[PDB]
Motif scaffolding. Sequence first.
Motif, PDB file in Angstrom:
ATOM      1  N   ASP A  43     -14.641   9.693  23.652  1.00  0.00           N
ATOM      2  CA  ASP A  43     -14.253  10.269  24.934  1.00  0.00           C
ATOM      3  C   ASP A  43     -12.764  10.580  25.021  1.00  0.00           C
ATOM      4  OD1 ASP A  43     -16.879  10.033  25.681  1.00  0.00           O
ATOM      5  OD2 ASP A  43     -16.580   8.344  27.054  1.00  0.00           O
ATOM      6  N   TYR A  44     -11.977  10.267  23.993  1.00  0.00           N
ATOM      7  CA  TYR A  44     -10.526  10.377  24.052  1.00  0.00           C
ATOM      8  C   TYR A  44     -10.016  11.386  23.036  1.00  0.00           C
ATOM      9  CZ  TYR A  44      -9.884   6.448  27.253  1.00  0.00           C
ATOM     10  OH  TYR A  44      -9.901   5.631  28.361  1.00  0.00           O
ATOM     11  N   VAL A  45      -8.877  11.990  23.356  1.00  0.00           N
ATOM     12  CA  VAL A  45      -8.141  12.819  22.418  1.00  0.00           C
ATOM     13  C   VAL A  45      -6.867  12.076  22.029  1.00  0.00           C
ATOM     14  CG1 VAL A  45      -8.990  14.725  23.824  1.00  0.00           C
ATOM     15  CG2 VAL A  45      -6.558  14.162  23.818  1.00  0.00           C
ATOM     16  N   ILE A  46      -6.204  12.571  20.987  1.00  0.00           N
ATOM     17  CA  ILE A  46      -4.986  11.965  20.469  1.00  0.00           C
ATOM     18  C   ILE A  46      -3.847  12.950  20.666  1.00  0.00           C
ATOM     19  CG2 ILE A  46      -3.789  11.103  18.435  1.00  0.00           C
ATOM     20  CD1 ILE A  46      -6.410  10.037  17.434  1.00  0.00           C
ATOM     21  N   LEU A  47      -2.833  12.529  21.419  1.00  0.00           N
ATOM     22  CA  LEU A  47      -1.680  13.354  21.741  1.00  0.00           C
ATOM     23  C   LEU A  47      -0.429  12.809  21.073  1.00  0.00           C
ATOM     24  CD1 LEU A  47      -1.772  14.415  25.488  1.00  0.00           C
ATOM     25  CD2 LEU A  47      -2.857  15.441  23.475  1.00  0.00           C
ATOM     26  N   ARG A  48       0.405  13.713  20.574  1.00  0.00           N
ATOM     27  CA  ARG A  48       1.785  13.381  20.245  1.00  0.00           C
ATOM     28  C   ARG A  48       2.628  13.731  21.463  1.00  0.00           C
ATOM     29  NH1 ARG A  48       2.484  14.941  15.034  1.00  0.00           N
ATOM     30  NH2 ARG A  48       2.802  17.160  15.532  1.00  0.00           N
ATOM     31  N   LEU A  49       3.151  12.706  22.138  1.00  0.00           N
ATOM     32  CA  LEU A  49       3.903  12.896  23.364  1.00  0.00           C
ATOM     33  C   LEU A  49       5.294  13.439  23.040  1.00  0.00           C
ATOM     34  CD1 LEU A  49       2.732   9.669  25.238  1.00  0.00           C
ATOM     35  CD2 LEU A  49       1.756  11.965  25.211  1.00  0.00           C
ATOM     36  N   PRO A  50       6.030  13.917  24.048  1.00  0.00           N
ATOM     37  CA  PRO A  50       7.402  14.380  23.788  1.00  0.00           C
ATOM     38  C   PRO A  50       8.251  13.379  23.029  1.00  0.00           C
ATOM     39  CG  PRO A  50       6.745  15.048  25.970  1.00  0.00           C
ATOM     40  CD  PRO A  50       5.590  14.257  25.415  1.00  0.00           C
ATOM     41  N   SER A  51       8.085  12.087  23.291  1.00  0.00           N
ATOM     42  CA  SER A  51       8.887  11.084  22.604  1.00  0.00           C
ATOM     43  C   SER A  51       8.460  10.859  21.160  1.00  0.00           C
ATOM     44  CB  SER A  51       8.830   9.765  23.372  1.00  0.00           C
ATOM     45  OG  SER A  51       7.494   9.337  23.531  1.00  0.00           O
ATOM     46  N   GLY A  52       7.398  11.512  20.701  1.00  0.00           N
ATOM     47  CA  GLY A  52       6.862  11.252  19.388  1.00  0.00           C
ATOM     48  C   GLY A  52       5.807  10.169  19.344  1.00  0.00           C
TER      49      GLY A  52
END
Lengths: 275, 48
Positions: free
Chosen positions: A170-179
């Motif tokens: 149910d989840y995706v994996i994000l690279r946030l602005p902070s890395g």
Amino acid sequence: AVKKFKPYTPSRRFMTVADFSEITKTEPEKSLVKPLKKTGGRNNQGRITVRFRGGGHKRLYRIIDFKRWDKVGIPAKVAAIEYDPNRSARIALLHYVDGEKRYIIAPDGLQVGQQVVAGPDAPIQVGNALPLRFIPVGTVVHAVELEPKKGAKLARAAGTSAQIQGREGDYVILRLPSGELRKVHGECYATVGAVGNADHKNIVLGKAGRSRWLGRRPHVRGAAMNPVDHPHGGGEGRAPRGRPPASPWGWQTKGLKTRKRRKPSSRFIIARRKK
Amino acid sequence: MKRTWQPNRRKRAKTHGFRARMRTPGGRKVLKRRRQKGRWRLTPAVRK
RNA sequence: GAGCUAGCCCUGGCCAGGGUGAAGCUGGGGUGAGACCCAGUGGAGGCCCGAACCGGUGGGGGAUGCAAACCCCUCGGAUGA
RNA sequence: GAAUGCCGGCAUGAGUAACGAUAAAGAGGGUGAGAAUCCCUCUCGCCGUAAGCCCAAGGGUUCCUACGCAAUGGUCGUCAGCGUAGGGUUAGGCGGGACCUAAGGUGAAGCCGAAAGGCGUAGCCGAAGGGCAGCCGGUUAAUAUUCCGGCCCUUCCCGCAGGUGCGAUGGGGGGACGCUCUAGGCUAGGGGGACCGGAGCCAUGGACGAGCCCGGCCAGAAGCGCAGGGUGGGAGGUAGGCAAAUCCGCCUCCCAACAAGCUCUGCGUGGUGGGGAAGCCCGGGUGACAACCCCCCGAAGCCAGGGAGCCAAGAAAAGCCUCUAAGCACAACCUGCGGGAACCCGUACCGCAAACCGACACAGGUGGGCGGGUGCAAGAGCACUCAGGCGCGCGGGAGAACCCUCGCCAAGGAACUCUGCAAGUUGGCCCCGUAACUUCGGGAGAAGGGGUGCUCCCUGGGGUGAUGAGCCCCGGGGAGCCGCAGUGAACAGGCUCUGGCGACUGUUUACCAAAAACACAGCUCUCUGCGAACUCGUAAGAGGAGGUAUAGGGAGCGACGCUUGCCCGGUGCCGGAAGGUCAAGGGGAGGGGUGCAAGCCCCGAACCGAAGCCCCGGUGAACGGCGGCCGUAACUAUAACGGUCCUAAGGUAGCGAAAUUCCUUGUCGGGUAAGUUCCGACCUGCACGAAAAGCGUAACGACCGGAGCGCUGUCUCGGCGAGGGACCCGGUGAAAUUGAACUGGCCGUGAAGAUGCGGCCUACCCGUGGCAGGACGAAAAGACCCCGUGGAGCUUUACUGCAGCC
RNA sequence: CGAUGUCGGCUCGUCGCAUCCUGGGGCUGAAGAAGGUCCCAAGGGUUGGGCUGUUCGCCCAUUAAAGCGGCACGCGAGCUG
RNA sequence: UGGGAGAGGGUGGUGGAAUUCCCGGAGUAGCGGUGAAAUGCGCAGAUACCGGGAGGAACGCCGAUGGCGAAGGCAGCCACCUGGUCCACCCGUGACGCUGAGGCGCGAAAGCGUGGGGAGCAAACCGGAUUAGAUACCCGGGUAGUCCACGCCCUAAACG
RNA sequence: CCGAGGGUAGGGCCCGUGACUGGGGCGAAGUCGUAACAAGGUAGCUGUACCGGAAGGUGCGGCUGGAU
Ligand SMILES: [Mg+2]
Ligand SMILES: [Mg+2]
Ligand SMILES: [Mg+2]
Ligand SMILES: [Mg+2]
Ligand SMILES: [Mg+2]
Ligand SMILES: [Mg+2]
Ligand SMILES: [Mg+2]
Ligand SMILES: [Mg+2]
Ligand SMILES: [Mg+2]
Ligand SMILES: [Mg+2]
Ligand SMILES: [Mg+2]
Ligand SMILES: [Mg+2]
Ligand SMILES: [Mg+2]
Ligand SMILES: [Mg+2]
Ligand SMILES: [Mg+2]
Ligand SMILES: [Mg+2]
Ligand SMILES: [Mg+2]
Ligand SMILES: [Mg+2]
Ligand SMILES: [Mg+2]
Ligand SMILES: [Mg+2]
Ligand SMILES: [Mg+2]
Ligand SMILES: [Mg+2]
Ligand SMILES: [Mg+2]
Ligand SMILES: [Mg+2]
Ligand SMILES: [Mg+2]
Ligand SMILES: [Mg+2]
Ligand SMILES: [Mg+2]
Ligand SMILES: [Mg+2]
Ligand SMILES: [Mg+2]
Ligand SMILES: [Mg+2]
Ligand SMILES: [Mg+2]
Ligand SMILES: [Mg+2]
Ligand SMILES: [Mg+2]
Ligand SMILES: [Mg+2]
Ligand SMILES: [Mg+2]
Ligand SMILES: [Mg+2]
Ligand SMILES: [Mg+2]
Ligand SMILES: [Mg+2]
Ligand SMILES: [Mg+2]
Ligand SMILES: [Mg+2]
Ligand SMILES: [Mg+2]
Ligand SMILES: [Mg+2]
Ligand SMILES: [Mg+2]
Ligand SMILES: [Mg+2]
Ligand SMILES: [Mg+2]
Ligand SMILES: [Mg+2]
Ligand SMILES: [Mg+2]
Ligand SMILES: [Mg+2]
Ligand SMILES: [Mg+2]
Ligand SMILES: [Mg+2]
Ligand SMILES: [Mg+2]
Ligand SMILES: [Mg+2]
Ligand SMILES: [Mg+2]
Ligand SMILES: [Mg+2]
Ligand SMILES: [Mg+2]
Ligand SMILES: [Mg+2]
Ligand SMILES: [Mg+2]
Ligand SMILES: [Mg+2]
Ligand SMILES: [Mg+2]
Ligand SMILES: [Mg+2]
Ligand SMILES: [Mg+2]
Ligand SMILES: [Mg+2]
Ligand SMILES: [Mg+2]
Ligand SMILES: [Mg+2]
Ligand SMILES: [Mg+2]
Ligand SMILES: [Mg+2]
Ligand SMILES: [Mg+2]
Ligand SMILES: [Mg+2]
Ligand SMILES: [Mg+2]
Ligand SMILES: [Mg+2]
Ligand SMILES: [Mg+2]
Ligand SMILES: [Mg+2]
Ligand SMILES: [Mg+2]
Ligand SMILES: [Mg+2]
Ligand SMILES: [Mg+2]
Ligand SMILES: [Mg+2]
Ligand SMILES: [Mg+2]
Ligand SMILES: [Mg+2]
Ligand SMILES: [Mg+2]
Ligand SMILES: [Mg+2]
Ligand SMILES: [Mg+2]
Ligand SMILES: [Mg+2]
Ligand SMILES: [Mg+2]
Ligand SMILES: [Mg+2]
Ligand SMILES: [Mg+2]
Ligand SMILES: [Mg+2]
Ligand SMILES: [Mg+2]
Ligand SMILES: [Mg+2]
Ligand SMILES: [Mg+2]
Ligand SMILES: [Mg+2]
Ligand SMILES: [Mg+2]
Ligand SMILES: [Mg+2]
Ligand SMILES: [Mg+2]
Ligand SMILES: [Mg+2]
Ligand SMILES: [Mg+2]
Ligand SMILES: [Mg+2]
Ligand SMILES: [Mg+2]
Ligand SMILES: [Mg+2]
Ligand SMILES: [Mg+2]
Ligand SMILES: [Mg+2]
Ligand SMILES: [Mg+2]
Ligand SMILES: [Mg+2]
Ligand SMILES: [Mg+2]
Ligand SMILES: [Mg+2]
Ligand SMILES: [Mg+2]
Ligand SMILES: [Mg+2]
Ligand SMILES: [Mg+2]
Ligand SMILES: [Mg+2]
Ligand SMILES: [Mg+2]
Ligand SMILES: [Mg+2]
Ligand SMILES: [Mg+2]
Ligand SMILES: [Mg+2]
Ligand SMILES: [Mg+2]
Ligand SMILES: [Mg+2]
Ligand SMILES: [Mg+2]
Ligand SMILES: [Mg+2]
Ligand SMILES: [Mg+2]
Ligand SMILES: [Mg+2]
Ligand SMILES: [Mg+2]
Ligand SMILES: [Mg+2]
Ligand SMILES: [Mg+2]
Ligand SMILES: [Mg+2]
Ligand SMILES: [Mg+2]
Ligand SMILES: [Mg+2]
Ligand SMILES: [Mg+2]
Ligand SMILES: [Mg+2]
Ligand SMILES: [Mg+2]
Ligand SMILES: [Mg+2]
Ligand SMILES: [Mg+2]
Ligand SMILES: [Mg+2]
Ligand SMILES: [Mg+2]
Ligand SMILES: [Mg+2]
Ligand SMILES: [Mg+2]
Ligand SMILES: [Mg+2]
Ligand SMILES: [Mg+2]
Ligand SMILES: [Mg+2]
Ligand SMILES: [Mg+2]
Ligand SMILES: [Mg+2]
Ligand SMILES: [Mg+2]
Ligand SMILES: [Mg+2]
Ligand SMILES: [Mg+2]
Ligand SMILES: [Mg+2]
Ligand SMILES: [Mg+2]
Ligand SMILES: [Mg+2]
Ligand SMILES: [Mg+2]
Ligand SMILES: [Mg+2]
Ligand SMILES: [Mg+2]
Ligand SMILES: [Mg+2]
Ligand SMILES: [Mg+2]
Ligand SMILES: [Mg+2]
Ligand SMILES: [Mg+2]
Ligand SMILES: [Mg+2]
Ligand SMILES: [Mg+2]
Ligand SMILES: [Mg+2]
Ligand SMILES: [Mg+2]
Ligand SMILES: [Mg+2]
Ligand SMILES: [Mg+2]
Ligand SMILES: [Mg+2]
Ligand SMILES: [Mg+2]
Ligand SMILES: [Mg+2]
Ligand SMILES: [Mg+2]
Ligand SMILES: [Mg+2]
Ligand SMILES: [Mg+2]
Ligand SMILES: [Mg+2]
Ligand SMILES: [Mg+2]
Ligand SMILES: [Mg+2]
Ligand SMILES: [Mg+2]
Ligand SMILES: [Mg+2]
Ligand SMILES: [Mg+2]
Ligand SMILES: [Mg+2]
Ligand SMILES: [Mg+2]
Ligand SMILES: [Mg+2]
Ligand SMILES: [Mg+2]
Ligand SMILES: [Mg+2]
Ligand SMILES: [Mg+2]
Ligand SMILES: [Mg+2]
Ligand SMILES: [Mg+2]
Ligand SMILES: [Mg+2]
Ligand SMILES: [Mg+2]
Ligand SMILES: [Mg+2]
Ligand SMILES: [Mg+2]
Ligand SMILES: [Mg+2]
Ligand SMILES: [Mg+2]
Ligand SMILES: [Mg+2]
Ligand SMILES: [Mg+2]
Ligand SMILES: [Mg+2]
Ligand SMILES: [Mg+2]
Ligand SMILES: [Mg+2]
Ligand SMILES: [Mg+2]
Ligand SMILES: [Mg+2]
Ligand SMILES: [Mg+2]
Ligand SMILES: [Mg+2]
Ligand SMILES: [Mg+2]
Ligand SMILES: [Mg+2]
Ligand SMILES: [Mg+2]
Ligand SMILES: [Mg+2]
Ligand SMILES: [Mg+2]
Ligand SMILES: [Mg+2]
Ligand SMILES: [Mg+2]
Ligand SMILES: [Mg+2]
Ligand SMILES: [Mg+2]
Ligand SMILES: [Mg+2]
Ligand SMILES: [Mg+2]
Ligand SMILES: [Mg+2]
Ligand SMILES: [Mg+2]
Ligand SMILES: [Mg+2]
Ligand SMILES: [Mg+2]
Ligand SMILES: [Mg+2]
Ligand SMILES: [Mg+2]
Ligand SMILES: [Mg+2]
Ligand SMILES: [Mg+2]
Ligand SMILES: [Mg+2]
Ligand SMILES: [Mg+2]
Ligand SMILES: [Mg+2]
Ligand SMILES: [Mg+2]
Ligand SMILES: [Mg+2]
Ligand SMILES: [Mg+2]
Ligand SMILES: [Mg+2]
Ligand SMILES: [Mg+2]
Ligand SMILES: [Mg+2]
Ligand SMILES: [Mg+2]
Ligand SMILES: [Mg+2]
Ligand SMILES: [Mg+2]
Ligand SMILES: [Mg+2]
Ligand SMILES: [Mg+2]
Ligand SMILES: [Mg+2]
Ligand SMILES: [Mg+2]
Ligand SMILES: [Mg+2]
Ligand SMILES: [Mg+2]
Ligand SMILES: [Mg+2]
Ligand SMILES: [Mg+2]
Ligand SMILES: [Mg+2]
Ligand SMILES: [Mg+2]
Ligand SMILES: [Mg+2]
Ligand SMILES: [Mg+2]
Ligand SMILES: [Mg+2]
Ligand SMILES: [Mg+2]
Ligand SMILES: [Mg+2]
Ligand SMILES: [Mg+2]
Ligand SMILES: [Mg+2]
Ligand SMILES: [Mg+2]
Ligand SMILES: [Mg+2]
Ligand SMILES: [Mg+2]
Ligand SMILES: [Mg+2]
Ligand SMILES: [Mg+2]
Ligand SMILES: [Mg+2]
Ligand SMILES: [Mg+2]
Ligand SMILES: [Mg+2]
Ligand SMILES: [Mg+2]
Ligand SMILES: [Mg+2]
Ligand SMILES: [Mg+2]
Ligand SMILES: [Mg+2]
Ligand SMILES: [Mg+2]
Ligand SMILES: [Mg+2]
Ligand SMILES: [Mg+2]
Ligand SMILES: [Mg+2]
Ligand SMILES: [Mg+2]
Ligand SMILES: [Mg+2]
Ligand SMILES: [Mg+2]
Ligand SMILES: [Mg+2]
Ligand SMILES: [Mg+2]
Ligand SMILES: [Mg+2]
Ligand SMILES: [Mg+2]
Ligand SMILES: [Mg+2]
Ligand SMILES: [Mg+2]
């Protein structure tokens, strides 16, 4: 492209301002502004709780649409791109064919006159918003919700963005602005593209007065104080720190991690920020 | 130079007035004590 | 007890006059196109001189004072934090 | 009889200081017991972006008049902000309330806290902000946009007529906004007129004049005129504006568009109502049937919600308009007109000050508006002066010292002194001209020099008119005149060379420090994934933030240029599912108390058992650290080189007798006749050194050094002059201090510095102006020092706790 | 210690004499001139500058000479600071 | 006019092999490195093997004594934009030419400024060896940089 | 009126000289190591950058004027 000045005063030598080139309208939508209650860093007890705040230029708050799943399927024409004093991003005024008018933060490449829409069936183009599970892996994205229907919380400042890295359940994996690599629920909404006004970080304030216009009162070093005031206070003449560098309150401020350890969201953070 | 007493009638009544004292435990103890001592004025007189 | 003083919040008000002349704009020159140069226009700035106003640099006076911080001369800021 | 005791009384100092801005007084007349001080007249002076006028605070009768003078008034007093008494403040339109919201405050619902109480969306309160209808004159001893007069206006109630789907606490529009600069046209205000009205004047040599002097407007409904503000119209579709909607929003179509129209304001005119000078006469009468016109200047005010540009992106809510919902559509609303109705509180007076804040009738402090004229480039600056207001609530003499503030000075010109401290010099405008260096902006008003008044003649452009005269603004060219001197008075930089520190504008020890200190743009480290970290709070709740890693917090460094080395052994921080140690708890071998017993009770081994610590590693723009000895080169000296001890590792670049250098005025060079300072070098750096940053750097500095030119009473070296004091006379009249005093010098003595003891010397009694050597003079139960098992602030790897966190 | 203000300068002096000069002398390895050393002598006199807070000292230019000490290291109810 | 070959240049896309890191599984006593070694890594589970993921840089075979450009220089593949150049026809113009002081533009690497990005490599730096010594060569690490954008620098055995 | 020149002030070029300092040339009979010429014992040279007592080293790219 940031704008420079000739050195006809000592401050204009270095001062730089935004070019304001994407801006097409210089007055806010009257129905979408409300008074912004300045605080000076004082809480409801009247006590300063964030030091060195106050005295900035007066501002009205423009209401921003940080949901957008509010109006699935209803397209809107990008009518104008405006200045917002309450954020680093620019904002975009949308005229929905509904007749309803809303503000979103302006993505990079957004063009006045173009159409945008939200929903599971939205095209993958700049300005459209979809639940994360319908946006292709690898596309850069912004205005991301952290939990479903709770509103956009991530990648909201000028020039920032998050990148979809993969899917897991149910989840995706994000690279946030902070890395940081974090799991975000797939039903969380996001808008494709990066936030605009990317040159924001190249602004040189130029003089002490500029900080004051922004409500930033002078910050005074702990080493300039007395022992009653600060761990670094005191000493005859100048002094080194004579102890691990510390805050006004005693906790060490060169490396000491402060995120709470038993926090539930740790289950959803894959890798802590780099750099 | 500018001295410390700068009379202001709204300021006076709003700070030391009867209704200000009644709002507060310490303020009601002031009125209790001044009545017990026999004070002719329980609160500073203000023109209004 | 914040009617003194310090900071902040809301809402009002004040800053004679003079000087310097940034960007931009127009015109001309230039070039393959430009950069750029020149003139005019323009009126920027924790810009300059200086009253009000805000200060308090040096000296003199005062020292059971005019005054428990004042007076004279001089001096700093004066569209800005 | 003493406690620098307590309360009171009264002395001394003493007829002494002083009588509170050096803006200033003189005479005559009057009143009265009494007059420098009260009233009146004339003369003189002072303020005039005020020292005049209006308003808001604050004050609370201080206002007006009569009658008083014991006290208050720094003297006097017949006077008064004083005593007694009487009078005086008049509003639908001015301000506030019966309207609206801002921060904030309060607070149905709700949340939290031992109690007291703390929060809290709505709502309510809260104004100098929004909204809202009165202008001019007259009148009183004292009120007036309030009374009166003229001309206007607002809301509410009722009624009449016309019109309309009427109707809201609901929807929408609007209200509604920054800073700087600024257009057009007006008004306020001002200047001139040879024009209009006017009582008069002809002096003292001249003038009967286009003479002098005085004035020559204010308000005004409709209408009209000029200038501006605001606003497109129609139809169709419609899923948004928590219901509805014909409104608003969105889409499309058709006419209109820098147009006119519609609408609102300003200004002008405008029926009408007012005002109306000098002078003369006793606040009033006259002037006067007053006249009331032309021209120029002109706002920062008005049209206004105008225009442009810029970034730091500039309240809300009601009144108002529109939409519809219940409902109601005999109503209700709108419009016009008429009649009626329209409450409460403030209103005196002071108000940059003698009535407010300063114990005082106190040289201090106090927000807004008006603030005329001429001249100086301008101006709210400066000088004078209008209207208006004052001469500052002790005076009269004198003409010493000394003090203060001020003026001048032969020759010299910094020789003064810690220092040119202070005071000179320079000084506005126009023109010419202007260096190193520079970040190309600057430095720069660099420096330095010339000009500056008045008269005549010729002449150019602009504004208002009309295109002209007139008025007004900006120039130019000749020729002359006078003085010592033309920004003729007042207001108005002395300049340059060279170092240190800080980039800069700023900020600071209210009242001994303004700086090199703080801040500052900028650099780096680090924390924080959002119910963020962090901060305040027991909590709830808040700030952070209606922000989201180009963001927010903490730390250091501090524009910019070129740079920022080596040491991770110790401390810190970060990473490490091994291992060691590890508390409660688990476990229960074994043992014990008691009981006739079942049983009850207690001890307790192995083993299991977290963070932390140990252990492994990383980490310096984290705390911090960054060596010694011996030897060695064709003279000596020195040591590129070698050896050796130690360390976690032995200081790199750059800089260096420095804001750091003890020896020290190091040595050398420069400058001076002479230089413990200064500048430039050298390097044996007592004890520089790289973000407690290192070395530089244009510009900047009431910062701190060194030098020179100019110029001076700073000095050689003092002199004279002015005013306010000091002195004398009249009036009023303090103070700290004080064991009592009939209180001399020397040499001695004395608790060791004697008016007071001894010896000798000297000395008639008492004052006044002066000077400061003594009275170990006054003041303050020593700012240093020590002591007290005295106190407080601060620190930490002191002790012991607590919060907080794990 | 219920206070005896502490360096230096300025101003104003006064005293001692172990005399810097001037006056008088003895001895000299005193020819003269000039010096050296000691004796008597305190009447008067004993300069202006650069450096440094300095006292002191060095240095410049002179001088008959550029004396040394005491007076609470004289003198802050005299000044400076 | 009609054709040709080409890593000529610019922009946007996109492919696979390999290295490194991270995750999962399986497995254990060494791996790595050299002339020989040691430092280093590894029972806290390395190396070797399988699966998954992330990321940057360079493009194997074709490839050549090859091709293109004025030089510097240019090499996976696709598209777009664009330069030079050769051939044939002998159609048009009618000497319109050659060179070129100055000027202007381009100009490998290293370096610089601002902002990204960072796998491998690697100045400086740390350590191990080597050596009489070894501030080197060799080995284990390692920061600028190497890569992208924009702006500078303007050098070379920029050579035929 | 112009005017030799004098005076005041501020610029420009040139020369001599200066505590101290930088490298250069020559001398050579010294100390240190041995960078280049042989594959010179790490092929050399090179632009640039960083570093080291010294010649020099290393990085990056280039040249052959490189042995086998
Ligand atoms: Mg842009
Ligand atoms: Mg600039
Ligand atoms: Mg500019
Ligand atoms: Mg520029
Ligand atoms: Mg500058
Ligand atoms: Mg701009
Ligand atoms: Mg923009
Ligand atoms: Mg606006
Ligand atoms: Mg609103
Ligand atoms: Mg708030
Ligand atoms: Mg509150
Ligand atoms: Mg509170
Ligand atoms: Mg804080
Ligand atoms: Mg604050
Ligand atoms: Mg914005
Ligand atoms: Mg920006
Ligand atoms: Mg910045
Ligand atoms: Mg701001
Ligand atoms: Mg800050
Ligand atoms: Mg600070
Ligand atoms: Mg301090
Ligand atoms: Mg405190
Ligand atoms: Mg403490
Ligand atoms: Mg404090
Ligand atoms: Mg502390
Ligand atoms: Mg400290
Ligand atoms: Mg210290
Ligand atoms: Mg300190
Ligand atoms: Mg120190
Ligand atoms: Mg300190
Ligand atoms: Mg300090
Ligand atoms: Mg400091
Ligand atoms: Mg430190
Ligand atoms: Mg310290
Ligand atoms: Mg320490
Ligand atoms: Mg979560
Ligand atoms: Mg006040
Ligand atoms: Mg009062
Ligand atoms: Mg009040
Ligand atoms: Mg009030
Ligand atoms: Mg008040
Ligand atoms: Mg009250
Ligand atoms: Mg009560
Ligand atoms: Mg009482
Ligand atoms: Mg009673
Ligand atoms: Mg009370
Ligand atoms: Mg306001
Ligand atoms: Mg001003
Ligand atoms: Mg101009
Ligand atoms: Mg423009
Ligand atoms: Mg300024
Ligand atoms: Mg200015
Ligand atoms: Mg200025
Ligand atoms: Mg002063
Ligand atoms: Mg002075
Ligand atoms: Mg004086
Ligand atoms: Mg005093
Ligand atoms: Mg005081
Ligand atoms: Mg004064
Ligand atoms: Mg004064
Ligand atoms: Mg001044
Ligand atoms: Mg000024
Ligand atoms: Mg000004
Ligand atoms: Mg402003
Ligand atoms: Mg300023
Ligand atoms: Mg007794
Ligand atoms: Mg006594
Ligand atoms: Mg007594
Ligand atoms: Mg007593
Ligand atoms: Mg007593
Ligand atoms: Mg007696
Ligand atoms: Mg006396
Ligand atoms: Mg005077
Ligand atoms: Mg009298
Ligand atoms: Mg009398
Ligand atoms: Mg009188
Ligand atoms: Mg006058
Ligand atoms: Mg005037
Ligand atoms: Mg009173
Ligand atoms: Mg009255
Ligand atoms: Mg009396
Ligand atoms: Mg009397
Ligand atoms: Mg009296
Ligand atoms: Mg008095
Ligand atoms: Mg009488
Ligand atoms: Mg009185
Ligand atoms: Mg009466
Ligand atoms: Mg009325
Ligand atoms: Mg009034
Ligand atoms: Mg009512
Ligand atoms: Mg209300
Ligand atoms: Mg109001
Ligand atoms: Mg009203
Ligand atoms: Mg009216
Ligand atoms: Mg009256
Ligand atoms: Mg009907
Ligand atoms: Mg608004
Ligand atoms: Mg407003
Ligand atoms: Mg005028
Ligand atoms: Mg006559
Ligand atoms: Mg008039
Ligand atoms: Mg008009
Ligand atoms: Mg609809
Ligand atoms: Mg009249
Ligand atoms: Mg008449
Ligand atoms: Mg007549
Ligand atoms: Mg103005
Ligand atoms: Mg901005
Ligand atoms: Mg509100
Ligand atoms: Mg119905
Ligand atoms: Mg109607
Ligand atoms: Mg009522
Ligand atoms: Mg009244
Ligand atoms: Mg008065
Ligand atoms: Mg005043
Ligand atoms: Mg007055
Ligand atoms: Mg007082
Ligand atoms: Mg008085
Ligand atoms: Mg007064
Ligand atoms: Mg006037
Ligand atoms: Mg003038
Ligand atoms: Mg002037
Ligand atoms: Mg002035
Ligand atoms: Mg006048
Ligand atoms: Mg007087
Ligand atoms: Mg006399
Ligand atoms: Mg003289
Ligand atoms: Mg001189
Ligand atoms: Mg002279
Ligand atoms: Mg000096
Ligand atoms: Mg002057
Ligand atoms: Mg120069
Ligand atoms: Mg320049
Ligand atoms: Mg000049
Ligand atoms: Mg200068
Ligand atoms: Mg004349
Ligand atoms: Mg004209
Ligand atoms: Mg004169
Ligand atoms: Mg004057
Ligand atoms: Mg000046
Ligand atoms: Mg200079
Ligand atoms: Mg110095
Ligand atoms: Mg410095
Ligand atoms: Mg400063
Ligand atoms: Mg400073
Ligand atoms: Mg600097
Ligand atoms: Mg700075
Ligand atoms: Mg500064
Ligand atoms: Mg300023
Ligand atoms: Mg103080
Ligand atoms: Mg102070
Ligand atoms: Mg104090
Ligand atoms: Mg103080
Ligand atoms: Mg002072
Ligand atoms: Mg101070
Ligand atoms: Mg200052
Ligand atoms: Mg400070
Ligand atoms: Mg600072
Ligand atoms: Mg920096
Ligand atoms: Mg707390
Ligand atoms: Mg909360
Ligand atoms: Mg918040
Ligand atoms: Mg909020
Ligand atoms: Mg809000
Ligand atoms: Mg934020
Ligand atoms: Mg600072
Ligand atoms: Mg430079
Ligand atoms: Mg360490
Ligand atoms: Mg460590
Ligand atoms: Mg194991
Ligand atoms: Mg057992
Ligand atoms: Mg037993
Ligand atoms: Mg670093
Ligand atoms: Mg250590
Ligand atoms: Mg440190
Ligand atoms: Mg030797
Ligand atoms: Mg050292
Ligand atoms: Mg090193
Ligand atoms: Mg030295
Ligand atoms: Mg130094
Ligand atoms: Mg030192
Ligand atoms: Mg020492
Ligand atoms: Mg020394
Ligand atoms: Mg010394
Ligand atoms: Mg010397
Ligand atoms: Mg000196
Ligand atoms: Mg000194
Ligand atoms: Mg030495
Ligand atoms: Mg520090
Ligand atoms: Mg320091
Ligand atoms: Mg440091
Ligand atoms: Mg500048
Ligand atoms: Mg300064
Ligand atoms: Mg300063
Ligand atoms: Mg004198
Ligand atoms: Mg005189
Ligand atoms: Mg005199
Ligand atoms: Mg006098
Ligand atoms: Mg006199
Ligand atoms: Mg007599
Ligand atoms: Mg006796
Ligand atoms: Mg004696
Ligand atoms: Mg005796
Ligand atoms: Mg006796
Ligand atoms: Mg006896
Ligand atoms: Mg006796
Ligand atoms: Mg005797
Ligand atoms: Mg005496
Ligand atoms: Mg005495
Ligand atoms: Mg005595
Ligand atoms: Mg004494
Ligand atoms: Mg004491
Ligand atoms: Mg005591
Ligand atoms: Mg004591
Ligand atoms: Mg004591
Ligand atoms: Mg003290
Ligand atoms: Mg002691
Ligand atoms: Mg004791
Ligand atoms: Mg003890
Ligand atoms: Mg004891
Ligand atoms: Mg204690
Ligand atoms: Mg914490
Ligand atoms: Mg003592
Ligand atoms: Mg005593
Ligand atoms: Mg005692
Ligand atoms: Mg005493
Ligand atoms: Mg003196
Ligand atoms: Mg003699
Ligand atoms: Mg002889
Ligand atoms: Mg003899
Ligand atoms: Mg003598
Ligand atoms: Mg004598
Ligand atoms: Mg001396
Ligand atoms: Mg000495
Ligand atoms: Mg010496
Ligand atoms: Mg001689
Ligand atoms: Mg003595
Ligand atoms: Mg002594
Ligand atoms: Mg001594
Ligand atoms: Mg003494
Ligand atoms: Mg002495
Ligand atoms: Mg003395
Ligand atoms: Mg004294
Ligand atoms: Mg003294
Ligand atoms: Mg004394
Ligand atoms: Mg004395
Ligand atoms: Mg005495
Ligand atoms: Mg002195
Ligand atoms: Mg001192
Ligand atoms: Mg190949
Ligand atoms: Mg042919
Ligand atoms: Mg290049
Ligand atoms: Mg590079
Ligand atoms: Mg890397
Ligand atoms: Mg060795
Ligand atoms: Mg770099
Ligand atoms: Mg080649
Ligand atoms: Mg001549
Ligand atoms: Mg060799
Ligand atoms: Mg070789
Ligand atoms: Mg080196
Ligand atoms: Mg070495
Ligand atoms: Mg190397
Ligand atoms: Mg090549
Ligand atoms: Mg060869």
